[PDB]
């Protein structure tokens, strides 16, 4: 019922802060489950070796301050709320060819009564691709996308890949190319600023090969 979901959203957000990490002790690391969903190759520049892909950047974490009791709100166990209103780990795509960080659309999130969040915002990424020179009578190229939190480091927000591979379940195949291979690898990355404090990326790559 509308009335209960209205009240629910008000009650949840009266004393909410989107600025603080949703943790009880500030030593807790927020666990974010990350997954890249590849949807469609929408452009292929062979001169500059750039491919524009349509993706969704699927994210999952738990916000402890957004739990509720379903009996208080007519048995409602989930709501959709705008992603602008909540705290987010600020996971971004980079190694982008034209415009260094990828702009991701802010779709609504699925929230549930345990404070679980699922967010699957769409984006357009532009990879740079390396030509694979091992054996290419049939041409092959390797395109990769890095994911990581823009500001938070590994001792505040840990990103964890949901799978070893990018999700190709809603991937619309091409007429010219085929994805030979595709994996995700998580890395610990260190920067000059910060000897003691690591950062985290997940690099998804796919090798696209031309059909005969």
């Amino acid at each position, epitope marked *: 019922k509308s009335e209960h979901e209205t*009240r*629910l959203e008000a*009650k949840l957000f009266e004393d909410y802060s989107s600025v603080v990490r949703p943790v009880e002790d500030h030593r807790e690391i927020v666990q974010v489950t990350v997954g890249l969903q590849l949807i469609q190759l929408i452009n292929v520049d062979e001169v500059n070796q750039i491919v524009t892909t349509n993706v969704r950047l699927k994210q999952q974490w738990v916000d402890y301050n*957004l*739990k509720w*009791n379903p*009996d*208080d*709100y007519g048995g409602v166990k989930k709501i959709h709320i705008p992603s602008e209103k909540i705290w987010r780990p600020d996971v971004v795509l980079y190694n982008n060819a034209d415009g260094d960080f990828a702009i991701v659309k802010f779709t609504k999130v699925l929230l549930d009564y345990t404070g679980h969040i699922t967010w699957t915002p769409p984006a357009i990424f532009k990879s740079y691709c390396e030509i694979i020179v091992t054996h290419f009578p049939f041409d092959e190229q390797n395109c990769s996308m890095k994911l990581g939190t823009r500001t938070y480091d590994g001792s505040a927000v840990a990103i964890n890949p949901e799978s070893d591979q990018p999700d190709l379940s809603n991937f619309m195949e091409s007429g010219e190319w085929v994805i030979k291979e595709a994996r995700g690898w998580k890395h610990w990355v260190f920067y000059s600023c910060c000897p003691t404090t690591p950062y985290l990326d997940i690099t998804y790559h796919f090798v696209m090969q031309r059909l005969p």
Partner: antibody, heavy 120, light 107 residues
Framework: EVQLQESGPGLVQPSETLSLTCTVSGFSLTSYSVSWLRQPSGKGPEWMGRMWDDGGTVYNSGLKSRLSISRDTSKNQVFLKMNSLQTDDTGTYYC??????????????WGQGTLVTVSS | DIVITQSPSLLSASVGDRVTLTCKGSQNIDNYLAWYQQKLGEAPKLLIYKTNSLQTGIPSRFSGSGSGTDYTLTISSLHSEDLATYYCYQYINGYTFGTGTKLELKR
């Protein structure tokens, strides 16, 4: 200061409505929610429903059609009406002042109670 | 909803004793658990909420503890005016109450 009193007739004969009242003092009902609980005989307590601080209401889904909660903020009274009674609804009936954290609620205070028994 | 069972059902103990009531849940309660005292013919009084927060006014002899599924109320030195029934209750998944631990004094 923080007080609740539950008033209402001990006897109501079956297949009728039960009308209770919860007179309140120490606080305003506009800033504090008030719930209704009851304990059936030879059983545990259970939450019947709530009068929200914002005027609206929510009910135990099992009692949803029978119940209807209201209030009068000048009289400092919260009312209950519960139609279609029967022998299984025999027990003590309390109203409570609810405290909250974010969207979660719990029962902070109680009144003495009221025994309500259903026989012809 | 989460079913709750209190042990011991009936408890006998003398003044000054360190009694401990338990309250185990059928599912994870995640620390959202309260305790109240019910003397006969009197309004129930809240002792503890959120597992271990002492209610304002309540004696320091009452204390709470637990996590996940198992919870406990402790009365460190038993007074005579603590003779009552003690009910635990849960408030994240519906509103369910404990069966009841009745406290009787040795003499």
């Amino acid at each position: 200061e923080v007080q609740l009193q539950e008033s209402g007739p001990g006897l109501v004969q079956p297949s009728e409505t039960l009308s209770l009242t919860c007179t309140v003092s120490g606080f305003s009902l506009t800033s504090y929610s008030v719930s209704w609980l009851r304990q059936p005989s030879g059983k545990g307590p259970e939450w019947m429903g709530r009068m929200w601080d914002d005027g609206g209401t929510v009910y135990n889904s099992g009692l949803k059609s029978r119940l209807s909660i209201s209030r009068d903020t000048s009289k400092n009274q919260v009312f209950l009406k519960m139609n279609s009674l029967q022998t299984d609804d025999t027990g003590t009936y309390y109203c409570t002042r609810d405290e909250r954290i974010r969207a979660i609620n719990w029962f902070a205070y109680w009144g003495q109670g009221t025994l309500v028994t259903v026989s012809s | 909803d989460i079913v709750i069972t209190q042990s011991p059902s009936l408890l006998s103990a003398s003044v000054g004793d360190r009694v401990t009531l338990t309250c185990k849940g059928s599912q994870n309660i995640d620390n959202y658990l309260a305790w109240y005292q019910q003397k006969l013919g009197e309004a129930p009084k809240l002792l503890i909420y959120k597992t271990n927060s002492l209610q304002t006014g309540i004696p320091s002899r009452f204390s709470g503890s637990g996590s996940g599924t198992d919870y406990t109320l402790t009365i460190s030195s038993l007074h005579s005016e603590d003779l009552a029934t003690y009910y635990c209750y849960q408030y994240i998944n519906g509103y369910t109450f404990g069966t009841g631990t009745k406290l009787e004094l040795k003499r």
